[PDB]
Design a protein around this motif. Structure first.
Motif, PDB file in Angstrom:
ATOM      1  N   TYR A   1       0.781  -1.228   0.000  1.00 10.89           N
ATOM      2  CA  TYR A   1       0.000   0.000   0.000  1.00 10.89           C
ATOM      3  C   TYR A   1       0.824   1.295   0.000  1.00 10.89           C
ATOM      4  N   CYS A   2       1.967   1.287   0.681  1.00 10.31           N
ATOM      5  CA  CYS A   2       2.774   2.479   0.830  1.00 10.31           C
ATOM      6  C   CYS A   2       4.227   2.232   0.482  1.00 10.31           C
ATOM      7  N   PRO A   3       4.517   2.038  -0.809  1.00  6.33           N
ATOM      8  CA  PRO A   3       5.912   1.809  -1.176  1.00  6.33           C
ATOM      9  C   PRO A   3       6.762   3.062  -1.020  1.00  6.33           C
ATOM     10  N   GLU A   4       7.918   2.880  -0.402  1.00  2.00           N
ATOM     11  CA  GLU A   4       8.915   3.960  -0.175  1.00  2.00           C
ATOM     12  C   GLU A   4       8.229   5.137   0.522  1.00  2.00           C
TER      13      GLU A   4
ATOM     14  N   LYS B   1      -0.765   4.593  -1.789  1.00  2.00           N
ATOM     15  CA  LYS B   1      -1.434   4.482  -3.075  1.00  2.00           C
ATOM     16  C   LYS B   1      -2.730   5.294  -3.042  1.00  2.00           C
ATOM     17  N   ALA B   2      -3.124   5.812  -4.191  1.00  2.00           N
ATOM     18  CA  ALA B   2      -4.310   6.640  -4.290  1.00  2.00           C
ATOM     19  C   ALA B   2      -5.544   5.790  -4.112  1.00  2.00           C
ATOM     20  N   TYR B   3      -6.683   6.435  -3.885  1.00  2.00           N
ATOM     21  CA  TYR B   3      -7.945   5.734  -3.697  1.00  2.00           C
ATOM     22  C   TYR B   3      -8.482   5.375  -5.070  1.00  2.00           C
ATOM     23  N   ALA B   4      -7.970   4.275  -5.601  1.00  2.00           N
ATOM     24  CA  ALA B   4      -8.294   3.785  -6.913  1.00  2.00           C
ATOM     25  C   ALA B   4      -7.876   2.332  -7.007  1.00  2.00           C
ATOM     26  N   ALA B   5      -8.260   1.711  -8.106  1.00  3.82           N
ATOM     27  CA  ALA B   5      -7.955   0.296  -8.422  1.00  3.82           C
ATOM     28  C   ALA B   5      -6.484   0.154  -8.819  1.00  3.82           C
ATOM     29  N   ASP B   6      -5.804  -0.877  -8.303  1.00  6.24           N
ATOM     30  CA  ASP B   6      -4.449  -1.316  -8.759  1.00  6.24           C
ATOM     31  C   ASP B   6      -4.586  -2.343  -9.887  1.00  6.24           C
TER      32      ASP B   6
ATOM     33  N   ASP C   1     -13.837  -1.091   1.034  1.00  2.05           N
ATOM     34  CA  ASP C   1     -12.930  -0.595   0.004  1.00  2.05           C
ATOM     35  C   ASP C   1     -12.714  -1.666  -1.056  1.00  2.05           C
ATOM     36  N   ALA C   2     -12.499  -2.893  -0.602  1.00  2.36           N
ATOM     37  CA  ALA C   2     -12.306  -4.056  -1.501  1.00  2.36           C
ATOM     38  C   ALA C   2     -13.562  -4.236  -2.347  1.00  2.36           C
ATOM     39  N   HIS C   3     -14.737  -4.147  -1.719  1.00  2.00           N
ATOM     40  CA  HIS C   3     -16.051  -4.278  -2.400  1.00  2.00           C
ATOM     41  C   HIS C   3     -16.157  -3.202  -3.476  1.00  2.00           C
ATOM     42  N   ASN C   4     -15.657  -1.986  -3.224  1.00  4.98           N
ATOM     43  CA  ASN C   4     -15.773  -0.826  -4.156  1.00  4.98           C
ATOM     44  C   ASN C   4     -14.718  -0.889  -5.262  1.00  4.98           C
ATOM     45  N   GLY C   5     -13.934  -1.964  -5.308  1.00  2.00           N
ATOM     46  CA  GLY C   5     -12.846  -2.161  -6.290  1.00  2.00           C
ATOM     47  C   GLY C   5     -11.645  -1.259  -6.048  1.00  2.00           C
ATOM     48  N   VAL C   6     -11.514  -0.783  -4.818  1.00  2.00           N
ATOM     49  CA  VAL C   6     -10.452   0.118  -4.407  1.00  2.00           C
ATOM     50  C   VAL C   6      -9.366  -0.711  -3.725  1.00  2.00           C
ATOM     51  N   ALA C   7      -8.104  -0.334  -3.902  1.00  2.00           N
ATOM     52  CA  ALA C   7      -7.011  -1.059  -3.288  1.00  2.00           C
ATOM     53  C   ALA C   7      -7.133  -1.226  -1.760  1.00  2.00           C
ATOM     54  N   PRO C   8      -6.654  -2.398  -1.239  1.00  2.00           N
ATOM     55  CA  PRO C   8      -6.782  -2.548   0.212  1.00  2.00           C
ATOM     56  C   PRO C   8      -5.909  -1.544   0.958  1.00  2.00           C
ATOM     57  N   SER C   9      -6.365  -1.122   2.135  1.00  2.00           N
ATOM     58  CA  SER C   9      -5.668  -0.144   2.924  1.00  2.00           C
ATOM     59  C   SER C   9      -5.690  -0.622   4.378  1.00  2.00           C
ATOM     60  N   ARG C  10      -5.091   0.153   5.261  1.00  2.00           N
ATOM     61  CA  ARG C  10      -5.017  -0.230   6.660  1.00  2.00           C
ATOM     62  C   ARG C  10      -6.380  -0.326   7.342  1.00  2.00           C
ATOM     63  N   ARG C  11      -7.271   0.619   7.067  1.00  2.00           N
ATOM     64  CA  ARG C  11      -8.584   0.567   7.680  1.00  2.00           C
ATOM     65  C   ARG C  11      -9.257  -0.739   7.271  1.00  2.00           C
ATOM     66  N   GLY C  12      -9.067  -1.184   6.003  1.00  2.00           N
ATOM     67  CA  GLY C  12      -9.607  -2.449   5.474  1.00  2.00           C
ATOM     68  C   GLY C  12      -9.272  -3.630   6.379  1.00  2.00           C
TER      69      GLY C  12
ATOM     70  N   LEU D   1     -11.684   6.144  10.546  1.00  2.00           N
ATOM     71  CA  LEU D   1     -10.426   6.150   9.747  1.00  2.00           C
ATOM     72  C   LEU D   1     -10.690   6.516   8.278  1.00  2.00           C
ATOM     73  N   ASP D   2      -9.916   7.461   7.716  1.00  2.84           N
ATOM     74  CA  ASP D   2      -9.983   7.796   6.303  1.00  2.84           C
ATOM     75  C   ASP D   2      -9.137   6.762   5.540  1.00  2.84           C
ATOM     76  N   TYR D   3      -9.195   6.783   4.220  1.00  2.00           N
ATOM     77  CA  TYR D   3      -8.470   5.793   3.440  1.00  2.00           C
ATOM     78  C   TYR D   3      -6.961   5.819   3.653  1.00  2.00           C
ATOM     79  N   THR D   4      -6.381   7.008   3.737  1.00  2.00           N
ATOM     80  CA  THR D   4      -4.939   7.113   3.905  1.00  2.00           C
ATOM     81  C   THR D   4      -4.465   7.315   5.335  1.00  2.00           C
ATOM     82  N   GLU D   5      -5.377   7.239   6.291  1.00  3.90           N
ATOM     83  CA  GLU D   5      -5.018   7.490   7.676  1.00  3.90           C
ATOM     84  C   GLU D   5      -4.329   6.330   8.448  1.00  3.90           C
ATOM     85  N   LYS D   6      -3.287   6.644   9.226  1.00  5.72           N
ATOM     86  CA  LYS D   6      -2.604   5.659  10.103  1.00  5.72           C
ATOM     87  C   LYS D   6      -3.468   5.398  11.334  1.00  5.72           C
ATOM     88  N   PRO D   7      -3.893   4.149  11.571  1.00  5.70           N
ATOM     89  CA  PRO D   7      -4.668   3.822  12.758  1.00  5.70           C
ATOM     90  C   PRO D   7      -3.897   4.124  14.041  1.00  5.70           C
ATOM     91  N   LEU D   8      -4.594   4.530  15.102  1.00  2.37           N
ATOM     92  CA  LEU D   8      -4.078   4.503  16.481  1.00  2.37           C
ATOM     93  C   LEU D   8      -4.290   3.105  17.055  1.00  2.37           C
TER      94      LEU D   8
END
Length: 317
Positions: free
Chosen positions: A180-183, A187-192, A207-218, A285-292
């Motif tokens: 999800y976060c290379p270097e 990744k943007a909120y879109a399909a890989d 997010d997976a259901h919406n065809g969006v790349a998996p993220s931490r909140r997922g 949690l937003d798509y790009t947000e780091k969980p606490l």
């Protein structure tokens, strides 16, 4: 076409030698090279797939960059953990047999999966067991996330117990894992385009259901569905798993109104407070947000205090 000759010595790229045993896809018992042939008490396993197999290549890379034994022990030391549920990478190479190229990977060997145990316990786990499993999963999740990876497929069948210690659970099957976060760049909120897997339909994320790349909140979302499945034996959308749009719709409605989910899944409007607080927190949690992660572990800990227990590490399976 058998991949190996039983008892064959294989040498990895690092030049370490291993003997191949009987099977435990293509997975076999493995140990360090010896006079003695490989046995039922083996400490390692060898996964072998064709060189062109994309999933083994994804898994190997994850193990190489986040699974080194030294990398894990340094984490367990600095975070003051009793253990970390990530399998260790022992080595890998290329192996020719009958003129086809194969890839192999040596990793730790585990015991029975949690799903076989779940089914043996009449598709229930106690509140204690679920709370204790979840604290260790959060540890695993935090680890792989800080190492730029999400799993996206957490489930009982992917959670193996230490063959020697039944109180220690590991998360496996990183074949479909996602960087999800290379270097350090999310990744943007879109399909890989390289990825075509949505996960396991009953547990997967919105997010997976919406065809969006998996993220931490997922991942935290997926864990939440597992907790309810493990506590109750059911999930509201289990009856019609064949309809993804229904499943997605049910999850969107139950994310909007958690109190509805607690009423549906738990008898008589009486439900574990920690599970509601968990799902409320993941929702924020937003798509790009780091969980606490610590806030989430504290929530599960308030639950152990409520049942008169503490995080003693006992899964009480």
């Amino acid at each position: 076409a058998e991949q190996f000759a039983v008892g064959e010595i294989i040498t990895d790229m690092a030049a370490a030698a291993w003997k191949v045993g009987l099977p435990i896809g293509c997975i076999y018992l493995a140990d360090m090279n010896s006079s003695e042939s490989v046995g039922s008490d083996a400490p390692c396993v060898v996964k072998v797939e064709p060189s062109d197999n994309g999933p083994l290549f994804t898994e190997l890379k994850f193990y190489q960059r986040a699974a080194k034994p030294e990398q894990i022990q340094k984490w367990i030391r600095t975070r003051k953990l009793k253990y970390l549920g990530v399998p260790k990478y022992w080595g890998s190479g290329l192996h020719d047999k009958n003129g086809k190229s194969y890839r192999f990977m040596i990793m730790d060997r585990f015991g029975s999966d949690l799903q076989k145990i779940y089914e043996a316990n009449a598709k229930r786990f106690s509140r204690k067991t679920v709370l204790q499993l979840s604290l260790r999963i959060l540890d695993i999740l935090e680890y792989i996330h800080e190492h730029e990876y999400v799993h996206g497929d957490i489930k009982a069948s992917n959670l193996l117990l230490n063959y020697k210690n039944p109180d220690q659970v590991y998360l496996v099957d990183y074949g479909l894992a996602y960087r999800y976060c290379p270097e350090g760049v999310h990744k943007a909120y879109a399909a890989d385009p390289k990825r075509c897997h949505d996960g396991t339909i009953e547990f997967t994320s919105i997010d997976a259901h919406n065809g969006v790349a998996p993220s931490r909140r997922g991942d935290l979302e997926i864990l939440g569905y597992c907790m309810i499945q493990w506590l109750t034996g059911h999930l509201p959308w289990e009856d019609n798993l064949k309809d993804p749009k229904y499943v997605r719709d049910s999850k969107i409605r139950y994310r909007e109104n958690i109190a509805s989910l607690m009423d549906k899944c738990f008898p008589a409007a009486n439900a574990p407070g920690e599970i509601a607080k968990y799902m409320e927190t993941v929702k924020l949690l937003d798509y790009t947000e780091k969980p606490l992660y610590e806030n989430l572990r504290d929530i599960l800990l308030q639950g152990l205090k409520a049942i008169g227990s503490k995080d003693d590490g006992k899964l009480d399976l």
